[PDB]
Design a protein around this ligand. Structure first.
Ligand SMILES: CCCCCCCCCCCCCC(=O)O[C@@H](CO)COC(=O)CCCCCCCC
Ligand SMILES: CCCCCCCCCO
Ligand SMILES: [K+]
Lengths: 96, 219, 211, 106, 219, 106
C-alpha cells in the first residue's frame, strides 16, 4: 500500500552503507577529507539529493566508485520518496 | 577498565621480527579503528598506521619506512602489529589507541617497550634501603628500594600495591655494561613506621618476574 | 600532509597564572584539532576534542579555542599536576598527524634538598658487592651538585647519578647518587659521606654514616 | 603556472644513511607529483608516481610522501648507484612543470 | 531614543556575582540578537557572547574564560548577563548592542562600569570653584566643580544639564586610598556671568545620588 | 577565529589632510567588515557597514574600501571631532571579532 516506506528504507540503507564504504575507501589517500563517518553521512545526503555543495567528495578510485553507487541507488530512491510526498500533497490540494 | 591491553616489553634481536598485541575490551563497534603510535625515547608521538577490525582494512604512514603489517582477530578482539627487520632505530614505546571513526583517540594503551639488542634478559635484584642506626628522624621518614642489574627496560615499582603514592619518587635508570639500575623512595609520617608495613612491589615484564620486599627497620 | 607546529616548546609559568599553548597548522583544518596530555612514564590522555569541546573527566580549567590554522589550549590556573607534555592532533585530512609537543614548567618556591644516605643492604653484601645510596629529594631549582667522601677523602670513581623530571606532586626535583664498590673494597673503609650543595644554603648539607 | 622548488640543490651524505629530497609547490597540487632519476649522459627514469606509489622495477629503498605543497622522496640506504639528479614534476594544473633538480653526493 | 538601557555601575565583592540588565526599546524583531562586549580600562573591545530573545538560544566566546550566563525576558524585553566568581581582572565596562541578524551592531548601550573590590560605596562631595577676588578677567571666565572622595567610578558631570558643552573639560579621576577625585571646568563669555546661572550636575550611579551646585561669585 | 590586525596603532596627521586606517584579516572575509568610532568615555558608534556602505548620520568625509583581507577607512579631511579610537569588526565567520584599534591624533 504505502511502499513509500520501503523506498525510504532503501534510501537510509544507501546513505549508511555509502558513508561507511566511503570512509573505508578514502582513508589511505593523503589529502582526503571524507575520512570520518559523521560528516560522511551528510555527504551521502548531499549526493543522493543531487545538491552537492562540494565541501566533501571522494578522491580515490573506489571512493568515486562508491559515489557512483550512491548516485544510482540514492537518487532513484530519493526520487521515489519525494514523488510520494508530492502525490500526498496534491491529495489535499482539493480538500480546500 | 583497561580497555586496551598490551604486553609489557619485547626484546628483539637485531634483524629479527616481533609481533605485538592489543586486546580490546569495552564496547566493540563495527566502525572502530585501531591505531598504533610509536614514541622513540626523548621524542614525541609518531603515527604508524591504522586498521579497522570489521573489514580487515589497514593503512600505514607513507612519511616514514613501512616496517609494519597490521592484522586483527575479530574472534578474540586483538589487533596485531608485526614489525620486521628491526634495527636500533626501532627501539621505542608502541601504543595502541581506539578511535570511534570520529577523529580522536578516546582511550590509549599502556604501551609496549620494544628493545632491539643482542644482549640477554636479566631479572632484577631488589635490595631494601633502611636508614642507619644514627639517623635523626624528622616528622617523616625516607626509605626506598634498589633495583639493580636488569635488562631490558622497564621495571614497575609500586609501594603497598599503590596504597602509598604521595611522596614517591622513581629515578630514571642508568646503563652500566648492558645492565640497568634505578631506585625508588617513600616519605611517610614517622609514627606510621614500622608500626605499619612498607613494601615495594617490583615488576620486570621482560623476564615475567614479580617480587615483593618488605622494608623492615635496621637493628 | 598537514604539519602541526607547537611554538614555543617549553612554557615556564608561576603557579596560579593563566597559561596558553599554541598549535599552528600548515593549512586550514577547520576545528578538527584534539589535545592530549602525557605525564612521565605515562600514556597520552585526551583533554579537549574538536578545538573546544570538553571531555568527561577533565578539570574545568582546561579549555580550548581556535579555528582555521591557529589553535589554543588554555589552563585557567596551573597547579603541580598539570606538569606534563601536551600534543595537538588533527583529523581533517589523511593521515592523522601529531604536533611537536610543548612542555609545561612551574616556577615554584625554592626548596632545600632532603638528604638521606643508606648503607648497603645485607642481602647485597651476601652476593659479594656493595653500594651506598644517597637521595636528594624535593629541592628547587634543579641545579644541584653532590659530593662523596670516603673517610673524609673525596672519591668519584663508581658514582652514578640520576635526575627526575619536575615532580607532578609539588613541582620540585629529585636525584639519586649511588656509589658502587666491591664488598672487598667497601670493607676497606669506615665512614662514607654524602655532600649535597644547593643554592638554598651557603653550607653544604651533609649526611654521613659509619660502618 | 605551478613553480616547483627543490631545496637544497646538492645533498651530500655518507653511505648507508637515510636521505630525503624536498619539493615544494607554489600552490596545493594534492598528490599529483612524480619523481624522476637521471644519471650522467642518461635519460630521465620514473621512480615514484603520485607522491608515494612505487613503480615496477625500482628498489624498495625508494619511497615518497607528502600532500598539498610539500613533498619528499626518500632513499632508505644510499649506495653508489643512487648518485644522479632527481626531478619532481606536477600534473595537477596545465602545463606540466618540472623542478629545478637536486644532485646527490656520497 | 536610547534604544538600550543599562545600569550605571555595579560594585561586586571579590568572589561574588553580579547580574547586569539591558532593556531594549524601539523595534523588536524575532530575528534580533543581543550581544555583550567587555572593555577593560585602557584596552579595546572584547566580545563576550550573544543571545537571541526569540528562541532563548545563547553563545559565548570560547577564546576566553566563560564566566557569563546569558538570559532574556521576552515579556519585559530585557537581556541579562550573569557574571559569577568575579576577580580583579573582570573589572571593566560591559556594553550591550543589538544586531538585526545581519552582521553589524546598529545601536549600542551606554555600558555598565563593573568594579570588583572589597571596599564600600562612598557618595561624592561637590565643592564650587569660583575665581578669587584679584583675578583679572579676560573676555572669558573659567570656573568649575570639584568632585572629591567617592567610590567607585564613575561620576557624570554636566553643566546646565547639557545646555553648556563647548569649552567643558572633565579630568580623569585619581585614586587616593580607596577614594576617587576629579574636577570639571567651564569657559563662558565674561559678560554672561553671573548675569546667567552656571551649575554643575554631578551624578554618582553607584550610590544613586544626584546633586546640583550653583557657581555663585565669590565676594 | 579570524584575527583583525590594525596597523599602525596611532595615526598622527595635520588638520585638513586625508587619513586612512588599515585593517588586515587573517583570512579572506569578502566584504563583511564594519567600522566603529569611540570617543573618550563614550560607546562605539557605527561608521561604515560592509566595507563601503555609509550609515545614516555620518559625515560624507568618512568612506571605506577593500575586499578579501585588506580594508581601509578614510577620512577625506580631518577636524577635531574625528579624534577617537577606530575599530574594525568582521561578520564572515563565527564568532564576530574586533580589531586591536587605532587612535587618531592631530
Ligand atoms: C557507520 C555510521 C555512519 C554514520 C554515523 C553518524 C553518527 C552521528 C553522530 C553525531 C555526532 C556528531 C559528531 C561531531 O561531534 O562533529 C560535528 C561537528 O563537526 C559534526 O556533526 C555531524 O557530523 C553531523 C552528523 C551527520 C548529519 C546527519 C545526516 C542525517 C541524514
Ligand atoms: C580501497 C578499499 C576498497 C573499499 C571498497 C568498498 C567496496 C566499494 C564498492 O563500490
Ligand atoms: K566549491
Amino acid at each position: 500500500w504505502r511502499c513509500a516506506g520501503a523506498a525510504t528504507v532503501l534510501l537510509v540503507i544507501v546513505l549508511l552503507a555509502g558513508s561507511y564504504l566511503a570512509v573505508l575507501a578514502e582513508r589511505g589517500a593523503p589529502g582526503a577529507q571524507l575520512i570520518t563517518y559523521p560528516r560522511a553521512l551528510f555527504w551521502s545526503v548531499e549526493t543522493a539529493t543531487t545538491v552537492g555543495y562540494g565541501d566533501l567528495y571522494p578522491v580515490t578510485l573506489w571512493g568515486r566508485l562508491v559515489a557512483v553507487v550512491v548516485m544510482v541507488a540514492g537518487i532513484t530512491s530519493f526520487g521515489l520518496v519525494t514523488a510520494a510526498l508530492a502525490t500526498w500533497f496534491v491529495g489535499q490540494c482539493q480538500q480546500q | 577498565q583497561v580497555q586496551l591491553q598490551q604486553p609489557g616489553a619485547e626484546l628483539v634481536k637485531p634483524g629479527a621480527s616481533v609481533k605485538l598485541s592489543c586486546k580490546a575490551s569495552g564496547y566493540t563497534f563495527t566502525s572502530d579503528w585501531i591505531h598504533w603510535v610509536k614514541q622513540r625515547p626523548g621524542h614525541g608521538l609518531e603515527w604508524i598506521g591504522e586498521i579497522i577490525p570489521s573489514y580487515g582494512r589497514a593503512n600505514y604512514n607513507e612519511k616514514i619506512q613501512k616496517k609494519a603489517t597490521l592484522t586483527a582477530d575479530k574472534s578474540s578482539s586483538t589487533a596485531f602489529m608485526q614489525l620486521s627487520s628491526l634495527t636500533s632505530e626501532d627501539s621505542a614505546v608502541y601504543y595502541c589507541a581506539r578511535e570511534r571513526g570520529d577523529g580522536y583517540f578516546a582511550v590509549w594503551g599502556a604501551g609496549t617497550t620494544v628493545t632491539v639488542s643482542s644482549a640477554k634478559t636479566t631479572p632484577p635484584s631488589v635490595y631494601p634501603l633502611a636508614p642507619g642506626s644514627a639517623a635523626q628522624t624528622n616528622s617523616m621518614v625516607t626509605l626506598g628500594c634498589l633495583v639493580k642489574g636488569y635488562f631490558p627496560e622497564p621495571v614497575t615499582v609500586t609501594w603497598n600495591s599503590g596504597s602509598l603514592s604521595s611522596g614517591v619518587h622513581t629515578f630514571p635508570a642508568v646503563l652500566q655494561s648492558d645492565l640497568y639500575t634505578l631506585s625508588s623512595s617513600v616519605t611517610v609520617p614517622s609514627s606510621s613506621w614500622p608500626s605499619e608495613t612498607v613494601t615495594c612491589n617490583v615488576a620486570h615484564p621482560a623476564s615475567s618476574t614479580k617480587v615483593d620486599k618488605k622494608i623492615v627497620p635496621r637493628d | 600532509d598537514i604539519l602541526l607546529t607547537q611554538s614555543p616548546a617549553i612554557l615556564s609559568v608561576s603557579p596560579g597564572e593563566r597559561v596558553s599553548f599554541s598549535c599552528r597548522a600548515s593549512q586550514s583544518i577547520g576545528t578538527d584539532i584534539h589535545w592530549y596530555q602525557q605525564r612521565t612514564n605515562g600514556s597520552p590522555r585526551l583533554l579537549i576534542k574538536y578545538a573546544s569541546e570538553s571531555i568527561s573527566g577533565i578539570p574545568s580549567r582546561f579549555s580550548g579555542s581556535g579555528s582555521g590554522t591557529d589553535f589554543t589550549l588554555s589552563i585557567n590556573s596551573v597547579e603541580s599536576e598539570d606538569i606534563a607534555n601536551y600534543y595537538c592532533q588533527q583529523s581533517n585530512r589523511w593521515p592523522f598527524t601529531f604536533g611537536s609537543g610543548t612542555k609545561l614548567e612551574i616556577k615554584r618556591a625554592d626548596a632545600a634538598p632532603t638528604v638521606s644516605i643508606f648503607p648497603p643492604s645485607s642481602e647485597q653484601l651476601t652476593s659479594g658487592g656493595a653500594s651506598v645510596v644517597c637521595f636528594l629529594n624535593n629541592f628547587y631549582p634543579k641545579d644541584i651538585n653532590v659530593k662523596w667522601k670516603i673517610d673524609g677523602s673525596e672519591r668519584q670513581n663508581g658514582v652514578l647519578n640520576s635526575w627526575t623530571d619536575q615532580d607532578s606532586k609539588d613541582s620540585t626535583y629529585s636525584m639519586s647518587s649511588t656509589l658502587t664498590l666491591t664488598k672487598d673494597e667497601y670493607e676497606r673503609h669506615n665512614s662514607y659521606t654524602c655532600e649535597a650543595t644547593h643554592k638554598t644554603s651557603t653550607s653544604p648539607i651533609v649526611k654521613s654514616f659509619n660502618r
